Structures are given as C-alpha cells and as structure tokens.
C-alpha cells in the first residue's frame, strides 16, 4: 500500500505544531525542502514532517532556537555516524586479531 | 585590476531579500560547509566565499555600495 | 599556595568585546563559572577569557545565539573525542597489517 | 514534595527568563544525547519534571501554593 503524501504549508504546520513563520525559517535553514523551492506554492513530502517532529522534540528538550537546533541535529548525526564507524573498526580489529 | 563576485548567487538569495533572509542563508551555508560535519569535497573553499559574501551583505552600508556597483557593471 | 589571578566581569568584557549582559547569559548557560558564583562580585580567571574567545569564533562561524553555541561546543568536543578514537583505531589496524 | 527550585538551582522569585536559562544549562549537562555525566538519566529526569512545572505560569502558581502548606 505504497503512497506519496504531500502537505501544503498550512497542512504541515497543523501536523507538526510549528507556525508558518517558523516553517519558513526551518526551510531557510535547510532543514527540509519543498518539492520546488522557487515555485509559487511550496509543497512538502511527508518525509519532511518526520524531520520537523524530530526538531520540535529537540527544541523542547534543549530549548534552542531553530538555527541552534539545525546545528545540534547535524552534530548529533555526525557523532552517531562516527560512533558506528568506530564500532566497525573495533570489530574489524578483533576479526583481524582472531585471524592472526 | 580587481575582483567583484556575485554575492547574492553565492548565498542563494535574491538581491531584494532582507537581512533576516540573508542571515538565514548564511546559517544554512555555514552548517553545510562547517569543517567538522561537511560532506562537501570543496567545503573550505566554498565556506571562504560564503563568508566573504556575508561580510558584505550583513553591513547595510557595504551592501548599498555593492548593489550600486553590481547593478551598473559593463 | 597556588595563585589564580582573577578579575571583574568588566575586565572580562574588555578582554573579549562581549557585553556584560551577554557575559551574564554565558555564565547562566554554564559556559563559564565565576570563582564564587554566590559572591556579590563575580570574579573570573584567564580560562574564562579562553572559553569566551572560542565561543565568539563559533558565533562568527555559525551565527548561533549563545544557548545554541553552548550545545554546539559540547557536541564538537564529543566529535573531537570520537575522531581521536577513530584515528587510534585506524593506527592499530595499520600496526596489525604491518606485523 | 520535590523542591523544584533547588533541582534547577534557581530562587523561588526568579522570572521565567532566568529559569529557562537554567533549564538550558541543565539540559545541556544531563540530556541523554549530550551528557557525559554518570547520573545523567536520574538527574535529567528530575530537571525535566521540574521544568515541566516551572515553565508554565498556572502550573507554577499551584506548585507554589502546594509548597507553602
């Protein structure tokens, strides 16, 4: 039951709880993108909704303005990526050492 | 014998955008090109250009002057 | 026996170019600590200057307000830690391959 | 009854702006994704609970009453 779900600015604001003004900043900061940025009407895929929900949770948990949230999420994801890479290297080293 | 770059294109904004809008674009581009997170191969060089554009466009006097020079180039 | 030279928020402002109001927020955010937080007059040492300078550089670089800078710096300290660990693990793999 | 003001290191008379700065500090210190503290979960649990109350004018008003009696 695959589907594509598309939201207008108003629908996205209703779904995520952010105001139209906040959504404009969130787009400007590059956190999400509409289908066509310079189209007269912005339309959003539901993948964008998921991103906004995450950023809303972090805004609440750390009480940062949107530019600080964008940066914090980028650093959290990079650190998580490095953590995964480090675990992989540890496993590879253990595998090598077992081989001898 | 000098250089004059397209600062609005560098920052991905329109010449008529207000300071708030340009500052948002700076924030976006600085996050994109920051050396500790950037996945862009030319990040250092791109950020340098962005910082140069922002140094001009964030100063309303410098911006006014730039606008006059850019608009009337031949 | 060990001596740490201290100075006022006014001197901190002079050394950093950050207003006393903003320095007061930076204190509130836990980025720097006065020697006696409860004392009627806050006094700081040179390490507070070092911390504020790093924060100013990040503010110029990313244009975040101070709460966002505080979190970013913490996460960047974690990034540097993970990077040092990554490099050490890569070196150990090379050492194994070369033995 | 918990001392929400002690938990956050603020005075009962502090304004919302001051308490919010304290929340920011303590969330940075103890948030599960940001903290390096061994007691992060326990400490953040108490801070988030306190902030849930103190950040809201009405919630804070009734807590203040409840603490006097």
UniProtKB/Swiss-Prot annotation, chain B:
DNA-binding protein that preferentially recognizes a curved DNA sequence. It is probably a functional analog of DnaJ; displays overlapping activities with DnaJ, but functions under different conditions, probably acting as a molecular chaperone in an adaptive response to environmental stresses other than heat shock. Lacks autonomous chaperone activity; binds native substrates and targets them for recognition by DnaK. Its activity is inhibited by the binding of CbpM. Induction: In late stationary phase, by phosphate-starvation conditions. The chain holds residues 2 to 73 of 306 of the full protein. It binds to curved DNA in a sequence-nonspecific fashion. The lineage of its organism: Bacteria, Pseudomonadati, Pseudomonadota, Gammaproteobacteria, Enterobacterales. It is found in: Cytoplasm, Nucleoid. This is Curved DNA-binding protein. Residues 6-70 form the J domain.
């Amino acid at each position: 039951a695959t589907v594509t779900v598309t939201f207008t600015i108003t629908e996205l604001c209703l779904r995520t709880g952010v105001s139209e003004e906040e959504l404009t900043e969130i787009v400007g900061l590059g956190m999400i993108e509409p289908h066509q940025p310079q189209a007269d009407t912005w339309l959003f895929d539901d993948s964008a909704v998921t991103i906004v929900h995450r950023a809303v949770r972090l805004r609440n948990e750390l009480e940062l303005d949107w530019p600080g949230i964008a940066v914090a999420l980028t650093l959290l994801d990079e650190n998580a990526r490095l953590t995964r890479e480090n675990r992989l290297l540890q496993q590879r080293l253990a595998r090598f050492l077992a081989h001898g | 014998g000098s250089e004059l770059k397209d600062y609005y294109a560098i920052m991905g904004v329109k010449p008529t955008d207000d300071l708030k809008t340009i500052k948002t674009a700076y924030r976006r581009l600085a996050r994109k090109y920051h050396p500790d997170v950037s996945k862009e191969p030319d990040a250092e060089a791109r950020f340098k250009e962005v910082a140069e554009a922002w140094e001009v466009l964030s100063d309303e006097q410098r911006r006014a002057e730039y606008d006059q020079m850019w608009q009337h180039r031949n």
